[PDB]
Amino acid sequence: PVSPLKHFVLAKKAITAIFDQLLEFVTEGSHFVEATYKNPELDRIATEDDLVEMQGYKDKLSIIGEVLSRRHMKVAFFGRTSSGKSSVINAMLWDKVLPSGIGHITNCFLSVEGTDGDKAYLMTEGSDEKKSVKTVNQLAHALHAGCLVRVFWPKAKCALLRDDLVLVDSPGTDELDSWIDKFCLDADVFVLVANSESTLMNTEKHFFHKVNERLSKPNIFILNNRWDASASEPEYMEDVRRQHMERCLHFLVEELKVVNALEAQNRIFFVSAKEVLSARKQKVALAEGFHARLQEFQNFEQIFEECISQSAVKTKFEQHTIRAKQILATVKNIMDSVNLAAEDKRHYSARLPKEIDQLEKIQNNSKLLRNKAVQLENELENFTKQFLPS
């Protein structure tokens, strides 16, 4: 039962390894191009612009590797006040990481990410201080288009955080474009948490219309929470479920048009975050239907993990994969140009045996480097076949 999130972890490892190799190769290639261009006994075998191109690639490949090394999956939770957003997050983390109450903050966000340490802490904006998580409920938020508070929870205690997932908790939806710009541009999945004792509201729909306008084919899940409230009323529950399904299906399929009606079955769930957290927190007869609701939450979790791991690998690693392929194609063109100029010179105007031998060594080293580029192209093609479907 391997978590689907390992797909993202393995992709991240693979592409960072390629970019480590690419920086090493381009550095070696740049030294060769530089030596060839700067040789006073050679004329226009390598050009000044060949060297400028190689040096420019060299100078930007380290930051690509560093950016890749921090890439992660992000899920953002939205919904009306008291719908259960924080409890859904806590259930997925197997602990009461986030508190309840304090629902008055109208514009500030909270994220949870993994720490390699063994103690939880938080950090506020523009600060490096590791503050006790028990101060979450005391942060003033006076002046605040709000702020982000970052919670760090030991990776050893939650597999999701170990596998590079970050979870974002939001204020109640009841300028929004500022929310999208500041928190949503790199979110891979959006989760709408709704009170199943109510009805899906237009204020929540409106926010996801804005997301859908700003982003292409966003991944959206709807969790109809507090489903324990109709336990022991199975006939009533059946009818409420039908009504919720009709409205949630129409929203995802007909209004947002982000899934077809079959796909939507894997995006709408009926759960009790309270029950799930109680079952998972370490250290009375269960309500009717408890195990069925727990299984439904576990089904959501599996489908969510599959969705976010596939989506984030494409969203976050494809552009630099395509860029690496372009860089390699250009480096090969430079090696082709150097080899061709050396061979032309050898056959057109080279005279002394020592000059001929010098040109032949330039040819040989340019081919060694070109073959290295081809091998890295093969690694990127393998990465594309494994991790980047059309």
Size of the site for Zn ion (CB under 5 A): 5
- Given a contact cutoff of 8 angstroms between Cβ atoms, the answer to whether 143 and 152 are in contact is no
Residue 141's binding partner out of ligand GTP, Mg ion, Zn ion, none, with CB under 5 to 8 Å set by partner kind: Zn ion
Residue with Cβ nearer ligand GTP (44 or 104):
104
Least Å distance between CB 84 and ligand GTP? Answer: 3
Q: Does 111 bind Mg ion (CB under 5 A)?
A: no
**Tokens found for residue 133:** 């998580």
Residue 274's binding partner out of Mg ion, ligand GTP, Zn ion, none, with CB under 5 to 8 Å set by partner kind: ligand GTP
**Tokens found for residue 53:** 């191109």
Phi-psi region of 79 (alpha: psi -120 to 50; beta: other; left: phi over 0): left
Size of the site for ligand GTP (CB under 6 A): 18
Element (H, E) at 27: helix 6-38
- How far apart CA 122 and CA 113 sit, in angstroms, is 10
* C-alpha dist (Å) from residue 19 to 109, 242, 319: 33, 50, 13
Residue with Cβ nearer Mg ion (191 or 338):
191
**Tokens found for residue 211:** 């997301």
367 among annotated binding-site residues: no
Residue with Cβ nearer Zn ion (118 or 128):
128
Identify residues 126-185 at the interface with ligand GTP (CB under 6 A). Answer: 172
End-to-end, the C-alpha distance of the chain in Å comes to 27
Q: Does 170 bind Mg ion (CB under 5 A)?
A: no
Stretch that binds ligand GTP, among 74-82, 198-206, 312-320, 344-352 (CB under 6 A): 74-82
User: x/- site string to ligand GTP, residues 202 to 241, per CB under 6 A?
Assistant: -----------------------xx-xx------------
Q: Which residues contact 221 (CB under 8 A, 6 or more apart)?
A: 189, 190, 191, 192, 267, 268, 269, 300, 304, 307
Determine which residue in the list 31, 119, 144, 354 makes contact with Zn ion, applying CB under 5 A.
144
Q: Which residues contact 320 (CB under 8 A, 6 or more apart)?
A: 15, 19, 64, 67, 68
Residue with Cβ nearer Zn ion (140 or 284):
140
337 among annotated binding-site residues: no
Q: Does 141 bind Zn ion (CB under 5 A)?
A: yes
Q: How many Cβ atoms are within 10 Å of 141's Cβ, its own excluded? A: 15
Identify residues 76-95 at the interface with Mg ion (CB under 5 A). Answer: 85-86
At 277 the three-state DSSP class reads helix
Stretch that binds Zn ion, among 23-31, 133-141, 204-212, 354-362 (CB under 5 A): 133-141
241 among annotated binding-site residues: no
Least Å distance between CB 270 and ligand GTP? Answer: 10
Q: Does 147 bind Zn ion (CB under 5 A)?
A: yes
Residue 31's binding partner out of Mg ion, ligand GTP, Zn ion, none, with CB under 5 to 8 Å set by partner kind: none
What residues form DSSP beta bridges with 220? 190
- Given a contact cutoff of 8 angstroms between Cβ atoms, the answer to whether 200 and 258 are in contact is no
Q: Does 196 bind Mg ion (CB under 5 A)?
A: no
94 among annotated binding-site residues: no
Phi-psi region of 76 (alpha: psi -120 to 50; beta: other; left: phi over 0): beta
- How far apart CA 23 and CA 39 sit, in angstroms, is 24
Binding site for Mg ion (CB under 5 A): 85-86
Binding site for ligand GTP (CB under 6 A): 79, 81-87, 100, 103, 172, 225-226, 228-229, 272-274
Annotated binding site for GTP: 82-87, 225-228, 272, 274
Binding site for Zn ion (CB under 5 A): 108, 141, 144, 146-147
